[PDB]
Design a protein around this ligand. Structure first.
Ligand SMILES: C[N+](C)(C)CCO
Length: 278
């Protein structure tokens, strides 16, 4: 029959790596072939694409983050434990959209606010509240996702009364260079970022708990599951298979060592026994 499915990703290192892992698992364990589609746009493009579907210029599968789905359902930022976010998005996406959340990959790739270790020492910074008290001295460099999202800087700034001198919208790798060069003093480091542990940076504590959990999980259209039921068990072979530290190392293989993400994804799966060498 030569059935195919479309796995989507937006264009950032982690997104492409885990989208490739999903594609590799499908091709290794089923007779399906995978179209890998890269979407330009923000944190909602894949959601609209999966509502369209791989037959109608959209996608069938992608890896979403629980807290993003949660804040989208609620219409305002909230905090909850990982189970609260996951169970809520799973039930709501099943009822409202016939989209099935599969099991979490294992890591929480949350937004953070991060500063240079030297700045944190010179002002004894530990928490977001500490940082807010001096924010009028500082420049924030942040991803477009962070500066535009309701779960991003808008709500955070309201809750903590952040008063940064200004914000600079920056590509993902650019913001690490910018904080290194002191063009900015704070960035929205993401917890799994490959460059993070390699730049002498301090992740500050979200002491008022503004951010939701951001656990990555594959999600799939129900009608694709209906046509190809094996996909459920196949994709759940990834359940809890990627820790925060493992994801960081894969991201660094791409962003720091220059390996291509397809190779990084496939080699990780082979080394962990999740696919076999052909
Ligand atoms: C994963 N983040 C929450 C850090 C943003 C991208 O969706």
């Amino acid at each position: 029959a030569n059935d195919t499915v479309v796995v989507g990703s937006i264009i950032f290192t982690e997104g492409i790596i885990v989208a490739n892992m999903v594609a590799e698992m499908i091709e290794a364990h089923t007779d399906l072939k995978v179209v890998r589609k890269l979407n330009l746009g923000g944190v909602n493009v894949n959601f609209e694409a999966i509502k369209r579907g791989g037959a109608n210029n959209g996608i069938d599968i992608y890896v979403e983050y629980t807290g993003h789905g949660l804040v989208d359902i609620l219409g305002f930022p909230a905090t909850t434990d990982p189970e609260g976010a996951y169970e809520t998005v799973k039930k709501e996406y099943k009822r409202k959209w016939n989209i099935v959340w599969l099991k979490p990959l294992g890591f929480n790739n949350t937004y953070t606010l991060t500063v240079k270790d030297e700045l944190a020492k010179q002002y004894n910074l530990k928490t977001f509240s500490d940082l807010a008290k001096i924010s009028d001295k500082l420049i924030l460099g942040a991803t477009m996702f962070f500066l535009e999202g309701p779960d991003g800087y808008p709500g955070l700034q309201k809750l903590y009364n952040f008063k940064f001198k200004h914000t600079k919208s920056m590509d993902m790798g650019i913001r690490y260079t910018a904080i290194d060069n002191n063009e900015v003093q704070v960035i929205d480091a993401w917890a799994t970022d490959g460059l993070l542990v390699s730049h002498k940076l301090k992740i500050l504590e979200d002491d008022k708990a503004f951010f939701p959990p951001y656990y990555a999980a594959p999600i799939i259209r129900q009608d694709v599951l209906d046509k190809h039921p094996e996909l459920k068990d196949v994709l759940n072979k990834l359940a809890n298979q990627i820790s925060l530290e493992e994801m960081q190392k894969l991201n660094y293989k791409v962003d720091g060592e220059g390996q291509d993400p397809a190779k990084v994804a496939k080699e990780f799966l082979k080394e962990k026994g999740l696919i076999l060498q052909v």
